[PDB]
């Protein structure tokens, strides 16, 4: 089998501890090559938990979370609370597609209890204060992408996308 | 705001297109194409809406409620449509080219004018401040182009001269900078001065005579003679889909428009006219 | 757009129509006008131009008559109705090239006078053949229609 | 699936064929062939449909209701046709060749250009989404060919050098030989760069002077002189026949189309023009 | 049965044969022979039809209506001709 | 339930028997209402066998038998030589459609074995011999549609429509 | 004369052994020659019954089953349920037509009476889940076309033709 985990992209930094193996196989769909980001999955109906941001499953179709699909085992301290599902790679909402995928694949999702003691009133949240992406790139986009700063020298263009191509809905709870 | 997001897209003609208009004897063509206001081909917003609505109702017969309430329910008119198309604006029409002592010998190029690019920039400006619809690079290219207005401009800097549609000699110059290609097609784009551009474009349209023949004796039936205008393959139109905030709009834009690539526009589809590719400018560039 | 070309063709036709003094030369030029535009747009401008000049008998007397036409309007073309009609059509083409800034008039008049520069004229015309063929069709068809309308069918 | 069935077919010319789109503004003496948007000859799907429909209405005189359902009524129509024809794309034209030196020479060859194969790719991609059809074999062949778009190539042959139509020297590069034939005759197929391909194809057309003669005195009648343009024998076009679900479409596709081999396109059929073989890609590949 | 009858024939040149293809400028023969698509000599079926129809019209003056029916009329065509000539392929040449 | 039997309409007179209901309720599928015959059934891949007139299963999709579906039951002297099939009324290949159907029907078709003994070559047959038109009105359209020539004033209309609508393929051996 | 057995090719595992002749005669009709599978038979108006899939008829020209025509006779345990039929080789709705056929054929087809005690609804089904194609090449062709695995290292081609050629219709009961 081939397996991936979906890592979010918040303006909070607890993200780099979510995977164990960097490559594992030889197939990463979310790849960046001299134009911008590609094959980023966008889940809908989930709401972030930015204090340890974990996508709480809500019912609002307007709520969404855009993150990248990377091959690796999730933390090797999971599979009891993460959302594990295998889907046939064609019904998956991902934007900026470049190439066709392997027709079926297993996905690990950061998850949580819904916490039904607090009215889940979500909120449209962008990624601004480019210092808050400046760090997470050298945090996430280096332990996920070694290819940056050895093939990517126009890092400004991997800034000018995460600036607006990555939004979500947070819960501020 | 009640127009919360916008979806700019391109309309690539896979086959020839005939979005008809009022047939009448004043245009040496019985069935002319829809003219915009400057004589350019256009697609009316109503034609786009109706065609895409029919296509979606056929292809997703379960999302029928979402489609009805985003693009306007027909049998229960009591609620405005949450979605709206702008008139499709001609962005580029293909033209036959004869190179003249140039580097890359092409046989056809994309031809635009400055009027069309002004209208495209109008559409792009009016939606750029929607906090998700950003596409800065596209309108930046359009502005670099519009600065050079007055001169027949080429984007890929190798032509310096050409004959367009076998009839129009024009001299071209670069843009002093590479200006990365608007579309990802491997064909140069020519932004022409408007006076000569109207001629090149009006010559790039297909004018066809058609007849009705009696099945028995292979003679033509009396009166069965008329002309139609088509818009060639490879022609590009530009339009925008505007959507209000309601949640069915979210699910529409989520999984109705992501699986929407080809669509039938216009009339005469039994003659194979009207197959169209929709390119969303949210993933390409 | 090529709408001034009809005025241009009217005056060029008036020139060559007065220059051809023999009526048989008029009818010969009529046949030339109806054949050579077909041939220009079926075989190319360069083949048909070589064919025209080979048939034109470009000797210095005929060339002087051509130049006088370019200037005088009292000039007269001589020399064997076939040859004179081919030279009248050569003048038609050259007159277009002059009045449309494709060829500098002084360089042309120099070519029709010296001999080394006639090959230079032909070489320049060779490099301008796509442009010329694209630009001159309206004019040549106007010439064809004028010749069919004004010169009696033989 | 927007379309129930989707059958691409080839249009091998058995005799020279002359489809019209008659005299232009300028060449009032010519009866030219129908042209594409980028200059190559084409068959408008209106001509395709009319001819094939007139043929079927006589060859299958008992399935006339199936034909009126799929290809439209013509007495009093009360609904659209369920069948569409795409315009015939020029796929390959024959050209005379003088091969310098190789395995036993050929005297003619099939010539195509990258622009034509690109249009074929567009047809195949668009209908692979509007149908459950998938032509992965033909599409893989065409993309392997389009990979080498710069250089003039030749298929399953070397030839390394040639004169086409006794006017055009081309240098040919053997692609890989791994790509099997497409129009599997014995003759090779040359994919030319489109600048030289346009010239070769224009030479491979047939322009014919024709006259009308007084019967009593064997002299040309005044005015009876004109030119016509023919597409040569062995020319291959490409088109698709598309249909929506009807239970008349299933009959049409499984009965009528499996027994449709030779039809008569275009005009001048009394002088033997127009006989055509259809080949139905789903079996010839 | 699109065609009622289908009668192939051979055309034998008794004397030398000349069907002209018209002149151009790059032809190097004032009067060339009608050529195939692959260079061989042919007879365009228009030439065949015209010659044969003229012959028949002056040869069978009583069956004129039959000729006009099968090979088309001459003055006011209100229907197509039922007859069809194909182009004459070169079959064999004496060497 | 909702049962119909399919009576073929050849130029032979050998089916005026195998209908033991003929009314059932008050409805039929094939109708005759002041414009012509409606809901005519077409069956493909089958040919008639006038000698023991039934439908023989060909595999040729160009073989069809056109007839009328009437609420009925053969004789009870069957259920060994009849195709008995229940299908949801939208698999019915009907021509001259007027209304809608019950979305589930039982249908009895006069069947036969292919008898792989003589090549099943077939021939198109159209209804000619207007004497046959008359006796097919008498044997079928009269004693199935009891209102024939009782309300319809334009019986020559249904004559003209029998002339053109019902054709079939016959083995003839 | 010469016997032809129709091997239907659905995704189900029920075609273990019911034919007899592996070679028997001196040829086949469906072949495999370096270009895919040729001369594939299609029967319209029939649907598979994937629980022991036999071609149950239906009067719907939209339903069809595609398969191969091997030369032979079935298992000498049948001729009580199969359709046997002889037809002049030009009624056959063939696809990928390569050769002409031999003027008459004895065709055996797995048959099941429609059994009108439950309505017949059909679903279009193709052959995916490459486990299926990998087992079916071995299951049928390695037993009938001993040419494969003895002519072709190009099994992937004679596999993709299966993946994109043999669709059919099922029942869902």
Short mmCIF file of C-alpha atoms in Angstrom, two decimals, chain A residues 60-62 93-97 164, chain B residues 134 245 247 250 254 258 282-283 285:
data_model
loop_
_atom_site.label_atom_id
_atom_site.label_comp_id
_atom_site.label_asym_id
_atom_site.label_seq_id
_atom_site.Cartn_x
_atom_site.Cartn_y
_atom_site.Cartn_z
CA UNK A 60 -21.11 23.47 8.14
CA UNK A 61 -20.13 23.02 4.47
CA UNK A 62 -18.81 26.59 4.48
CA UNK A 93 -11.34 17.65 -3.07
CA UNK A 94 -7.86 18.94 -3.92
CA UNK A 95 -7.18 22.21 -5.71
CA UNK A 96 -4.39 23.02 -8.18
CA UNK A 97 -4.09 19.50 -9.56
CA UNK A 164 -3.79 33.80 0.44
CA UNK B 134 -6.42 37.68 -5.63
CA UNK B 245 -22.57 33.84 0.89
CA UNK B 247 -24.16 27.74 2.24
CA UNK B 250 -20.36 26.83 -0.75
CA UNK B 254 -17.00 22.95 -3.74
CA UNK B 258 -14.44 21.26 -9.29
CA UNK B 282 -7.76 29.73 -9.25
CA UNK B 283 -5.53 26.77 -10.07
CA UNK B 285 -1.80 30.77 -12.74
#
